[PDB]
Amino acid sequence: QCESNPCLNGGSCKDDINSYECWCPFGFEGKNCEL
Amino acid sequence: VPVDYHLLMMFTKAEHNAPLQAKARVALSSLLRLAKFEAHEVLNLHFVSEEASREVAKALLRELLPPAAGFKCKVIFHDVAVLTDKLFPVVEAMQKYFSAGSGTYYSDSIFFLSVAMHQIMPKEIPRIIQLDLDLKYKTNIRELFEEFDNFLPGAVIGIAREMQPVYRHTFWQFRHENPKTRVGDPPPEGLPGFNSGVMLLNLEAMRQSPLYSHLLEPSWVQQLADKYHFRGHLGDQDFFTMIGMEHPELFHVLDCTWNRQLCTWWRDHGYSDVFQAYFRCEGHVKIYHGNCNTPIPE
């Protein structure tokens, strides 16, 4: 399986190879919406 | 006149996977402990397994059978490799939308088994219930079969709603372009999508539905996935959720007590505010579902 992409855009797995930006759900920040 | 009841469970890669074996143990012991069937009835347990997991399952089952309640039980194994090959022609075009991640690998095909179960099982099987193994049964599974009787005209599958906002997240773009949509919203009024842990697959109704047959076609899968800007990695669950948005008539929605999901992963990944509206389930619980490796209480 894969870890769900925390980002709102791109593929359903995190670190989607065809994705560069990461739009995080409200209240979260970082490349993996960590903080 | 003997009356057969059919359940199907996926049980693959179980050798040297102690967590999976322990889940299977909890599910199957509670299932069999609480099951009650009349004298002429037989419970058929279908397992989809490669050869190592078949042996693991056999060792577990001999410890649990025959059931305390003394009813007739038959065990059947299906080769994951054989099923994979039968599924692939039907299921190929949807894989790129609903599999981790892309593109189209044989290893993902089995996660779409429910969608084409009516083409895989012999025609003699009119109905089957597909169940995860990270479940715990708190009632007689025979009672779930009466839900088939509540299927309205045109309905082919019985399934419970998804109890996290995962589809709120997945449908973000469609939701963005359609502010007023119910797609991805919580119940009682929204369409939060579906969870695949417990599914009533009416194989006859699936076979006999023109609508359902069309939605399996590559061009219809593509049109809807484009319409909804939909990408997932949860397989059958994602396909049903998607066609469930277009064609809710196809699904008999089971009450949440038939698949009480315990996973809270999405609460801590951006959905604290709304999480409760999705996760709320009340009533007497029939099946607990310890999804995303969530310990089941007792």
Ligand SMILES: O=c1ccn([C@@H]2O[C@H](COP(=O)(O)OP(=O)(O)O[C@H]3OC[C@@H](O)[C@H](O)[C@H]3O)[C@@H](O)[C@H]2O)c(=O)[nH]1
């Ligand atoms: O290695 C495995 C993994 C899974 N399985 C079977 O497949 C089921 C699905 O996996 P889990 O139950 O661990 O996962 P979840 O209940 O969290 O399901 C979630 O992730 C996997 C997706 O296919 C499901 O559609 C989704 O709801 C298991 O209950 C089990 O019956 C195996 O037989 N072997």
Ligand SMILES: *[C@@H]1O[C@H](CO)[C@@H](O)[C@H](O[C@H]2OC[C@@H](O)[C@H](O)[C@H]2O)[C@H]1O
């Ligand atoms: C996103 O990835 C996480 C981490 O791997 C998964 O736990 C999520 O799945 C869980 O929540 C949604 C439910 O439908 C699944 O059954 C459950 O495992 C995934 O959305």
Ligand SMILES: [Mn+2]
């Ligand atoms: Mn599960």
